[PDB]
C-alpha cells in the first residue's frame, strides 16, 4: 500500500512480459489470465502485412473444433468485428446483442458452443503489425462498463501483448 500498487502490478507484468523470451509465452500469459478466472475460452488474432509475401493473419484459441472449423469454413473473418479497427471507436469492443445485430449467425453459433458473452481489444503501432485479443465467458450476463478493474487491465493486456509480441515478431 503506497498509492502505486496498480503501477507495481504493471511493473511486475512488464518484467514478466520481458522474461517470456518468446511470442508464444507472451500471448499464452494473457489467455491464462482468462483461464485463471475459469471464464470459458480464450483468443488472440495477429496480422503481419509483409511486403515480401502475400498478406496474412494468424489466430490462436482453446475453442471447440466445431466452432473453429465452422468459423473458418464459411470465412466468418468477413463478418466478425473483433478484427476490424473501424469498430473500435474508443480502441475497445463489448459484446451485446446490438453489436451482433448483423452478426446473428456468429452470435447464435457462439452461444451454442459456450461463448455466452465476451470482452475485446485492439492496438495500432508505428513499428507496424496489427493485433487483437478476446476472452469469452460462459456467464451470459450483461456487459455494463465491463467492471473497472477488468476494463483497465484489458487495455493493459492488449498494450503489453501487442508491445512484447511486436518486439519479438517485427512484422
Ligand atoms: C478461428 C478462430 C479465430 C479466433 C479469434 C476470434 C474469432 C471468434 O470466434 N469470434 C467470435 C466468437 C463470438 O464472438 C465473436 O466475435
UniProtKB/Swiss-Prot annotation:
Superkingdom of origin? Bacteria
Which GO terms of the molecular function aspect are on file? DNA binding
Null mutant phenotype reads:
A double sdiA/ydiV deletion mutant leads to decreased cAMP levels which inhibits quorum sensing system 2.
Q: Which GO terms describe its biological process?
A: cell division; positive regulation of DNA-templated transcription initiation
Q: What induces it?
A: Repressed by glucose.
**Keyword line:** Activator, Cell cycle, Cell division, DNA-binding, Transcription, Transcription regulation
Q: What does this protein do?
A: Activates cell division by specifically increasing transcription from one of the two promoters that lie immediately upstream of the ftsQAZ gene cluster. Activates ydiV expression in response to extracellular autoinducer AI-1 (Vibrio fischeri autoinducer oxoC6).
Know anything about its domains from the record? Binding to the autoinducer occurs via the N-terminal 170 residues; as E.coli does not produce LuxI autoinducers endogenously it should be able to bind to a number of different AI-1 autoinducers, which would enable it to detect other bacteria. This was shown to be the case.
This one is known as Regulatory protein SdiA
Q: Which organism is it from?
A: Escherichia coli (strain K12)
Part of the full-length chain shown: 1 to 171 of 240
Amino acid at each position: 500500500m503506497s498509492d502505486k500498487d496498480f503501477f507495481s502490478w504493471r511493473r511486475t507484468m512488464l518484467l514478466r512480459f520481458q522474461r517470456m523470451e518468446t511470442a508464444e509465452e507472451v500471448y499464452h500469459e494473457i489467455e491464462l489470465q482468462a483461464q485463471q478466472l475459469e471464464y470459458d475460452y480464450y483468443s488472440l488474432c495477429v496480422r503481419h502485412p509483409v511486403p515480401f509475401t502475400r498478406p496474412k493473419v494468424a489466430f490462436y484459441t482453446n475453442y471447440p473444433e466445431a466452432w473453429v472449423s465452422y468459423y473458418q469454413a464459411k470465412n466468418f473473418l468477413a463478418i466478425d468485428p473483433v478484427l476490424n479497427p473501424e469498430n473500435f471507436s474508443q480502441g475497445h469492443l463489448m459484446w451485446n446483442d446490438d453489436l451482433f445485430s448483423e452478426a446473428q449467425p456468429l452470435w447464435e453459433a457462439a452461444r451454442a458452443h459456450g461463448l455466452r458473452r465476451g470482452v475485446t481489444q485492439y492496438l495500432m503501432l508505428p513499428e507496424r503489425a496489427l493485433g487483437f485479443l478476446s476472452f469469452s465467458r460462459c456467464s451470459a450476463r450483461e456487459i455494463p462498463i465491463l467492471s473497472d478493474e477488468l476494463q483497465l487491465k484489458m487495455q493493459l493486456l492488449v498494450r503489453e501483448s501487442l508491445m512484447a509480441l511486436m518486439r519479438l515478431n517485427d512484422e
